Write a protein that binds this ligand. Structure first.
Ligand SMILES: [Zn+2]
Lengths: 433, 568, 193, 195
C-alpha cells in the first residue's frame, strides 16, 4: 500500500529538482521545458529544437506546474495537486486557456497529453477526462490509473498501472473524425524496477522518488511506432501495431550492451542514457557522464545511438578479452535481423500512411539489398561448414534473384557441388514465381 | 496606446518583414549619443539584428538639428527608421515635414500601409498626442502608461479631432482644457529603454547573459537621477539573474566562466578600481551626508576610518592589494560603524560580473566608465560643430567599451572617470566656498564665469554630472528647501553659455508619500516660451530638453525674463 | 612540512599551467619563450596571481621569503615538463614579480614591513661589482671523505655547513667545500636614495 | 609584383584556415529543409554537394562543408558536432603516445590545430567536454610537438627529410626556415661537387 501506490506526476523525459532549482518538465522531440524558482515561485522556460518554425519563450508562473507536454502546435501545462491545467498554443492566432480539473480526496494528476483533435488529462484515481483544444469538455471516462502519456499528431499512447492489474498499455488513435482504437489495457513486457529498488542504489534513490516506475520516456517514432525506455535500458517497439492480433513487442536497442561495446571493454555505469526520440535507427539521447542520472540546465548535445538487437552474446564477444571486436558470424545475422524488422516496419507505413519524405521506396530497396547481402553471407558461412541443408534452408528467404545467382556462384565455388543443383532448382522455381 | 508591452513582437516581425533583405540595407537606427540607456538599447538591437543578419545602419545624433538634416539626407529606399532615446515629446511628422499621403502605398478594405515606418523608442513621459494617437507612420514603443493613464487625454484628443452651439463650444473648451493640462508638464522618465528592449527579446526568446548584462547596465544608468525607476525595475533584473544563471553553482573558477551575481555593492565611487578612502571621499552620497567640501569634512572622514579600525595606510591602498583580512570584513565593519554617521544607505545590493580571471566589476562602476568615455573619450557656428563631431565620435568609444575583448579601453574609461570626478569635486568645492549659487525664490542660479578646466563643462554630460553633485549636496541639507537649479558655463572660444536647468530631488533612501510623486523638470517649456519671443540667438536642439546654448551678452536678459516667467 | 610545501608547489604549478586571459596561456608561452633564448626566469604579474586564486597571493604576501623558493621550484618543474622530452641539469628558475601596489616612501619603511613585500621608488647611487653566491654546494667530509651536496635557496629567513660528520667522530666541523663541483650565481649590491 | 612578398612561397594562416574550411564536418541542424510530400529555394552550389543541405531534418546529423556549418552556426540554425579526436579521452591518448614515442609524431589529423581554433571560437558551446580542458590539452599537444620539431630541425641535411604525421599549420610555419636552410646547405654541397 506504498511505494508504487504513489501516482506521483510524470511527464515524458522528466527530471527531478535534485540539489538545484533547475527541473526539466518534458523533453519531447520538438523541444524541452525547464523551471527555475525565483526564491518564491517558478519561472517556466520552453525551448524548441527546430528553431525556424517556433520561437522559445519564458513566462512567470505562480501555480508551480508539475506536468508539461509539447506538440507541434501547442504545449499543455498541468499541476499535481489541485491540478488546474493550462493549454497554450505556440501561434498567437489561438488564444491560450486554463481550466481546473475535478479533484477528489487523494487525487493527483499523473500525466497530461494533448492532440490537435483532443486534449487528455490523467488522474491517479484512473480517470480519462478529455477536452477540446479550446477547453470545452468532451467526455469523462474511468480506466486503470494512468501513469504516463505521449501523443503523436493524431494518435495517443498511454500506459496504465495499478497494484492489481499491473502494467497495461493502450494505443488509441483519436483521429480527425474517427476514434479508431488499436489497443486497450493490453499487457506489456516492460520490467518494473523491483530488485534495484531494494535499498541498494547510489544516487538513484532521488530519481526513483521522482518517478516511482522509473520509465524515462514513451516517445513515438517518425512512423508512429511506440517506444518505451526505462530502468532496463532497452527500447520496446511495436512492429505490427496496426493489427491488435499481430501485437509484437520487439526489443530493438540494448543501451547497456551498446555502451559496453563502445566503451572499450569496461562495464561502465557512469554513463546514463536519456532518450528523446527515435527515427529509423536514429535514437537521440543525452549521454550524461557522472553520478547524476538527470542532465543539467545546459542541456548537452543530443548524441545519436543506433539500434542493435540483444543478439550480442557475451560468450562470443569475450573472444578477445581485455574498438571492441565483433564476431563476424553473428554480426551479419544481426544486420539481417535489423534489415528484416526495418523492412517490415516500413512496409506497414508504405501502403497505409503513404510516402513520408519521397525517399522511403529507395531506402527500402537499399535495405532489401543489404537484407539479401546478409543472407548471402550467412549462406557462405553455412557452406563453410559443409552443411548443404543449412545453406538450402537459408536460401529460401532470398528476395532478389540476382542475389540467388550470387548464391549459385557461392555454391559452385565453396567446395559444394551438391548445393549447385538445389540452388539452381530454387532459381528455376523462382522463374515461374 | 500604440505598441503595448504584449505586442512588441508584432513590431519586431513588422520590421523583419519590411527590411530583412540581404540585398541592401533598408534599416537605419538613429541613436541619441550622450545617453547610456540609448547606447545599451542600441547595442541590444545591434546584437539582435546581427543574429538575424538584418543589415542596418547606426547613426549617433546629438541634437534635433542633426536629426532633421539626416532625415532630409535620408534616402527613400530606407523603409524602417528607429529613433532610440528621443522623438517621443515632439511633433515628429511636423518636425520632419512628414505628410502621410506621400508615404502611403496600397491604401486598399479597412487597412493602410506606408512606405516608411518610424519607430520611436524613448522613456520621456510627455508623449506627444499627435504621435501616440494621431499618426500611423510614427509608431511608439509604449511601456503601458498610455493604455492606463491617458484615457481622458485619448477621449479629449479624439473628440477635438472628429469635431473639427453654446453647449458644443463649452464642451470643446472643457476637452481642450484636458489637453492643455496634459501639456505644461515637466519631462520625467518612467522606464529604461534597455528594459523595454529586453522585454521585447524575452518575447522573441533571444535572451542570454550578454543581453541581460546590457539590460542591467541600461537600468543602472538611471540610479543616479531617477532612483525610483531603478528601484521599480530592480526586482525584474533580480529575477532574471536567478533564471539565467546555470545550476552548476559553487564550481571551480575557469578562464571561461562569466558570472552575473547579486552581492553587496556598496554605493561608493569605483570601489573596486580605487582605494577605499578615495571611494568614500569622491562619493556623491558620502559628500552630501558629511559635507566633505568644507575643511571639517576630511577630518570627519579620517575619524570615521579610525573608528572602523581601518588604518589610513590600508584605507588608501588600492582595492586589489588591500589585505585580505580587512577586505573580507567590509560587511561586518560597515554594519557596525555606518549608522553612526548616517551612511546606512551606503550598504546596498548590486550586480557584479566576473569574466574568468579578469576580476570583478559592478554595473555601477561599468556605467561610470562608459559615461567617462562618452564625456572625455577623445567663428562661433563652426567650432561648436567640431564639438558635436567629437561628441559623436566619443559614442563609438563608449560602444566599443562594451565588448569583452576591449578591456584595455574599459580601464581607460575607469581612469577618465576618476579624473572627471576629481575635477567635479574641485569645481564643487570652488562653487560652494565662494557661495556662487545665488539663492532665489524661483530657482537657485549658479553661473560659472571663470576658473580652471572650464572647458570640461561645455559637454552636457559633464555639466549634468556637476549638477548632480550639487543637487545631491543640497538635497541632504534640511534648511535648503527644494528648488530647481540652473548651471551655466561660458565657452570662451564661441562666446556662448550652456544653461542647464536641473531639477531637485529628495534625499536618497527617504521614502515618503511626497517622495512617491516624481519631480518634473519644467525648464523645457520655459526655455521654449522665452525663446519664441525676444529673439536671443538661443540654440534649443538638445534631446535633453532643459539644456540650451545662449550668447554671452544675452544670458542676463534671458535669466531676467525667465525670472519673470512663472511657467516653472 | 613536506606535505604543505608540496601542496604550495603544486598550486603554483597549476597557476603556471592553467592561467590564461583570452585563448592564450600567458605564462606557459612566456616560460617557453624565455627558455628558448636561455632566459631562465619568469616575470609574473601580481594582478594575475590575485585574480587566479587569492589564497595563493595571501600565502605569498604573508611569508614571501618562505613561499617564493617554492614558486621557483614550481617554475623549474613546469620548465622541465614543457621543454624536456620525458625519457635535466636545468637551473632553478628565478621569479621576477611585477606589482602595482601603492608605493611606500623609502623613509616610511620602519619596523613594520619587515619581511613583507614592499614596492618603492628611488634613484640608484651605487652598484657593487658582482659577487658569487653558491646554490649547489658540493661538500666533502674532512676525515671519512663522505661527499654530499647542499642546495641553497638564497632567500635568507631573517644556512651553514652542517656541524656533524653526517655519516670516526670526524670532529665538530668536518666539511670542506669542493669548489670544482659547486655551482654559483652572481649577486650585486645596490644602494637606493 | 602581382603576388606580395609575404605570399611568395608560403601560405598565410588565413589561407590555411580557408583550406581547412572546405573539409566536411558533421552537424545537427536546427532547421528542416526537407520538402514534405504534401515556394522554396534550394542551395544548388557549384563547389560542393547540395544534396545534404536540401535534406536537412532538425536534430538529424548530416555532413556539410565546414564553411557552411560555420555560416549556419552564426545564427542558431545548426550545432557543429566536434570530431571524435577532439575529446578529452582521445587527446589524453595522443598525449600519452607523444610522451611514449620521442622519435615520431602522433597521428593527429592534418587540420587539428586549425579545426581546434575554429571550433573553440565559433562553436564553444557544442562540446561534451569542458572547453577549458580541451584548450589545456590542445596546448599540451602543441608544446610536445614543438619540442620534437626543434630536436629534428637538428637533422637538416641536404638530401631530404621525413616529417611524418606533422600537421598542416606546423608545416606551414616551419616552411620558410626549413626550405631556406636546406637550400643553402644544398648550394654549398653542389658548389663543392663542381668537379
Ligand atoms: Zn666524517
Amino acid at each position: 500500500n506504498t511505494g508504487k501506490f504513489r501516482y506521483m506526476p510524470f511527464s515524458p523525459a522528466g527530471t527531478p529538482f535534485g540539489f538545484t532549482d533547475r527541473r526539466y518538465l518534458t523533453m519531447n522531440e520538438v523541444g524541452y521545458v525547464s523551471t527555475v524558482k525565483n526564491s518564491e515561485q517558478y519561472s517556466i522556460t520552453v525551448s524548441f529544437f527546430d528553431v525556424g518554425r517556433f520561437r522559445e519563450y519564458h513566462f512567470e508562473d505562480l501555480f508551480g506546474y508539475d506536468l508539461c507536454f509539447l506538440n507541434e502546435k501547442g504545449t499543455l501545462f498541468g499541476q499535481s495537486k489541485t491540478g488546474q491545467i493550462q493549454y497554450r498554443p505556440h501561434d498567437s492566432i489561438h488564444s491560450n486557456w486554463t481550466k481546473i480539473i475535478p479533484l477528489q480526496a487523494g487525487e493527483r494528476i499523473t500525466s497530461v497529453a494533448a492532440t490537435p483533435v483532443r486534449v487528455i488529462v490523467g488522474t491517479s484515481l484512473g480517470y480519462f477526462r478529455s477536452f477540446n483544444q479550446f477547453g470545452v469538455p468532451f467526455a469523462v471516462e474511468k480506466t486503470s490509473p494512468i501513469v504516463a502519456l505521449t501523443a503523436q499528431n493524431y494518435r495517443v499512447f498511454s500506459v496504465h498501472y495499478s497494484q492489481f492489474h499491473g502494467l497495461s498499455y493502450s494505443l488509441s488513435e483519436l483521429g480527425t473524425s474517427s476514434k479508431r482504437y488499436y489497443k486497450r489495457e493490453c499487457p506489456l513486457p516492460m520490467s518494473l524496477p523491483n530488485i534495484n529498488s531494494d535499498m541498494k542504489k547510489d544516487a538513484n534513490l532521488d530519481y526513483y522518488n521522482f518517478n516511482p516506475m522509473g520509465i524515462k520516456s514513451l516517445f513515438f517514432s517518425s512512423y508512429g511506432d511506440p517506444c518505451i525506455f526505462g530502468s532496463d535500458n532497452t527500447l520496446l517497439l511495436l512492429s505490427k501495431w496496426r493489427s491488435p492480433e499481430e501485437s509484437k513487442w520487439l526489443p530493438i536497442l540494448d543501451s547497456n550492451m551498446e555502451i559496453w561495446k563502445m566503451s572499450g571493454g569496461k562495464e561502465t555505469t557512469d554513463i546514463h542514457v536519456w532518450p528523446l526520440a527515435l527515427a529509423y535507427d536514429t535514437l537521440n539521447c543525452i549521454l550524461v557522464k557522472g553520478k547524476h542520472i538527470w542532465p543539467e540546465f545546459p542541456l548537452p548535445l543530443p548524441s545519436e545511438m543506433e539500434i542493435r538487437m540483444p543478439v550480442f552474446v557475451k560468450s562470443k564477444l569475450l573472444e578477445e578479452n581485455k574498438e571492441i571486436q565483433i564476431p563476424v558470424s553473428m554480426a551479419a545475422e544481426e544486420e539481417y535481423l535489423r534489415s528484416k524488422v526495418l523492412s517490415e516496419l516500413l512496409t506497414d507505413t508504405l501502403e497505409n500512411d503513404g510516402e513520408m519524405y519521397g525517399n522511403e521506396n529507395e531506402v527500402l530497396a537499399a535495405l532489401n539489398g543489404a537484407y539479401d547481402k546478409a543472407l548471402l553471407r550467412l549462406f557462405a558461412s553455412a557452406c563453410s561448414d559443409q552443411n548443404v541443408e543449412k545453406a538450402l534452408s537459408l536460401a529460401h528467404e532470398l528476395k532478389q534473384d540476382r542475389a540467388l545467382t550470387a548464391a549459385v556462384k557461392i555454391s559452385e565455388r565453396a567446395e559444394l557441388p551438391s548445393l549447385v543443383k538445389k540452388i539452381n532448382n530454387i532459381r528455376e522455381a523462382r522463374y515461374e514465381q | 496606446m500604440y505598441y503595448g508591452i504584449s505586442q512588441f513582437s508584432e513590431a519586431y516581425n513588422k520590421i523583419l518583414r519590411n527590411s530583412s533583405s540581404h540585398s541592401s540595407c533598408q534599416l537605419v537606427i538613429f541613436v541619441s549619443c550622450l545617453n547610456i540607456d540609448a547606447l545599451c538599447a542600441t547595442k541590444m538591437l545591434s546584437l539582435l539584428f546581427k543574429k538575424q543578419l538584418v543589415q542596418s545602419q547606426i547613426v549617433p545624433i546629438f541634437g534635433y538639428s542633426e536629426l532633421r538634416r539626416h532625415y532630409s539626407q535620408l534616402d527613400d529606399n530606407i523603409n524602417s527608421l528607429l529613433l532610440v532615446g528621443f522623438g517621443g515629446v515632439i511633433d515628429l511628422e511636423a518636425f520632419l515635414e512628414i505628410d502621410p499621403q506621400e508615404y502611403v502605398i496600397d491604401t486598399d478594405s479597412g487597412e493602410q500601409s506606408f512606405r516608411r515606418d518610424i519607430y520611436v523608442l524613448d522613456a520621456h513621459r510627455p508623449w506627444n498626442l499627435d504621435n501616440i494617437f494621431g499618426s500611423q507612420i510614427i509608431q511608439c514603443f509604449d511601456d503601458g502608461t498610455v493604455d492606463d493613464t491617458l484615457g481622458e487625454q485619448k477621449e479629449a484628443y479624439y473628440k477635438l479631432l472628429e469635431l473639427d452651439r453654446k453647449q458644443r463650444k463649452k464642451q470643446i473648451h472643457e476637452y481642450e482644457g484636458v489637453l492643455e493640462e496634459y501639456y505644461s508638464q515637466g519631462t520625467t522618465v518612467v522606464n529604461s529603454i534597455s528594459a523595454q528592449i529586453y522585454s521585447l527579446l524575452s518575447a522573441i526568446g533571444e535572451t542570454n547573459l550578454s543581453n541581460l548584462w546590457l539590460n542591467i547596465l541600461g537600468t543602472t544608468s538611471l540610479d543616479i537621477a531617477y532612483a525610483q525607476v531603478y528601484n521599480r525595475l530592480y526586482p525584474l533584473l533580480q529575477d532574471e539573474v536567478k533564471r539565467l544563471t546555470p545550476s552548476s553553482r559553487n564550481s571551480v573558477k575557469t578562464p571561461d566562466t562569466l558570472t552575473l551575481n547579486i552581492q553587496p555593492d556598496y554605493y561608493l565611487f569605483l570601489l573596486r578600481h580605487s582605494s577605499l578612502y578615495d571611494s568614500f571621499y569622491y562619493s556623491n552620497y558620502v559628500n552630501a551626508k558629511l559635507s566633505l567640501w568644507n575643511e571639517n569634512g576630511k577630518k570627519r572622514l579620517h575619524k570615521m576610518f579610525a573608528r572602523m579600525g581601518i588604518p589610513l595606510s590600508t584605507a588608501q591602498e588600492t582595492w586589489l592589494y588591500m589585505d585580505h583580512s580587512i577586505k573580507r570584513e567590509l560587511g561586518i565593519i560597515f554594519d557596525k560603524n555606518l549608522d553612526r554617521y548616517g551612511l546606512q544607505d551606503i550598504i546596498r545590493d548590486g550586480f557584479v560580473r566576473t569574466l574568468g580571471y579578469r576580476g570583478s566589476i559592478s554595473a555601477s562602476e561599468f556605467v561610470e566608465a562608459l559615461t567617462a568615455l562618452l564625456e572625455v573619450g577623445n567663428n562661433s557656428a563652426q567650432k561648436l560643430t567640431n564639438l558635436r563631431k567629437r561628441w559623436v565620435s566619443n559614442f563609438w568609444l563608449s560602444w566599443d567599451a562594451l565588448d569583452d575583448r576591449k578591456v584595455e579601453l574599459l580601464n581607460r574609461g575607469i581612469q577618465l572617470a576618476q579624473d572627471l570626478q576629481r575635477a567635479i569635486f574641485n569645481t564643487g568645492v570652488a562653487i560652494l566656498e565662494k557661495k556662487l549659487i545665488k539663492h532665489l525664490r524661483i530657482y537657485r542660479l549658479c553661473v560659472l564665469q571663470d576658473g580652471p578646466d572650464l572647458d570640461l563643462y561645455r559637454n552636457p554630460l559633464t555639466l549634468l554630472r556637476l549638477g548632480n553633485w550639487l543637487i545631491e549636496c543640497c538635497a541632504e541639507s534640511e534648511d535648503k528647501q527644494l528648488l530647481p537649479m540652473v548651471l551655466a558655463s561660458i565657452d570662451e572660444n564661441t562666446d556662448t553659455y550652456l544653461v542647464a536647468g536641473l531639477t531637485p530631488r529628495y534625499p536618497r533612501g527617504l521614502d515618503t508619500i511626497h517622495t512617491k510623486k516624481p519631480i518634473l523638470n519644467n525648464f523645457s517649456m520655459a526655455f521654449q516660451q522665452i525663446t519664441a519671443e525676444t529673439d536671443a540667438k538661443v540654440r534649443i536642439d538638445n534631446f535633453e530638453s532643459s539644456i540650451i546654448e545662449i550668447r554671452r551678452e544675452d544670458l542676463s536678459p534671458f535669466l531676467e525674463k525667465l525670472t519673470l516667467s512663472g511657467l516653472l | 612540512n613536506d606535505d604543505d610545501n608540496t601542496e604550495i608547489i603544486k598550486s603554483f604549478k597549476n597557476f603556471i599551467l592553467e592561467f590564461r586571459l583570452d585563448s592564450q596561456f600567458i605564462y606557459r608561452d612566456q616560460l617557453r619563450n624565455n627558455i628558448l633564448v636561455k632566459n631562465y626566469s619568469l616575470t609574473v604579474n601580481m594582478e594575475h596571481l590575485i585574480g587566479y586564486n587569492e589564497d595563493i597571493y595571501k600565502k605569498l604576501s604573508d611569508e614571501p621569503s618562505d613561499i617564493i623558493p617554492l614558486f621557483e621550484t614550481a617554475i623549474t618543474q613546469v620548465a622541465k615538463r614543457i621543454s624536456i622530452l620525458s625519457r635535466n641539469s636545468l637551473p632553478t628558475f628565478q621569479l621576477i614579480l611585477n606589482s602595482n601596489a601603492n608605493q611606500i616612501p623609502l623613509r616610511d619603511l620602519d619596523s613594520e614591513h619587515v619581511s613583507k613585500i614592499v614596492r618603492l621608488s628611488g634613484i640608484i647611487i651605487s652598484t657593487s661589482v658582482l659577487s658569487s653566491r653558491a646554490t649547489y654546494l658540493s661538500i666533502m667530509c674532512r676525515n671519512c671523505r663522505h661527499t654530499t651536496s647542499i642546495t641553497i635557496n638564497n632567500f635568507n629567513s631573517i644556512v651553514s655547513l652542517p656541524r656533524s660528520c653526517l655519516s670516526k667522530n670526524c670532529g665538530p666541523d668536518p666539511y670542506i667545500i669542493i669548489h670544482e663541483s659547486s655551482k654559483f650565481i652572481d649577486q650585486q649590491f645596490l644602494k637606493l636614495q | 609584383m602581382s603576388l606580395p612578398a609575404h605570399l611568395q612561397q608560403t601560405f598565410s594562416p588565413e589561407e590555411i584556415q580557408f583550406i581547412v574550411e572546405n573539409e566536411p564536418i558533421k552537424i545537427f541542424p536546427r532547421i528542416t529543409t526537407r520538402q514534405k510530400i504534401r515556394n522554396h529555394t534550394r542551395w544548388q552550389l557549384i563547389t560542393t554537394d547540395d544534396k545534404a543541405l536540401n535534406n536537412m531534418v532538425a536534430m538529424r546529423s548530416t555532413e556539410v562543408v565546414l564553411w557552411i556549418a560555420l555560416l549556419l552556426k552564426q545564427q542558431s540554425k545548426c550545432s557543429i558536432v566536434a570530431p571524435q579526436w577532439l575529446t578529452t579521452k582521445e587527446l589524453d591518448r595522443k598525449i600519452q603516445y607523444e610522451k611514449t614515442h620521442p622519435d615520431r609524431f602522433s597521428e593527429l589529423p592534418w587540420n587539428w590545430l586549425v579545426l581546434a581554433r575554429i571550433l573553440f571560437n565559433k562553436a564553444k558551446d557544442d562540446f561534451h567536454d569542458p572547453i577549458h580542458e580541451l584548450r589545456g590539452k590542445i596546448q599540451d599537444l602543441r608544446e610536445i610537438r614543438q619540442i620534437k620539431v626543434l630536436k629534428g630541425l637538428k637533422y637538416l641535411n641536404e638530401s631530404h627529410l621525413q616529417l611524418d604525421n606533422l600537421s598542416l599549420l606546423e608545416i606551414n610555419e616551419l616552411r620558410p626556415f626549413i626550405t631556406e636552410i636546406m637550400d643553402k646547405l644544398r648550394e654549398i654541397h653542389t658548389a663543392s661537387l663542381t668537379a
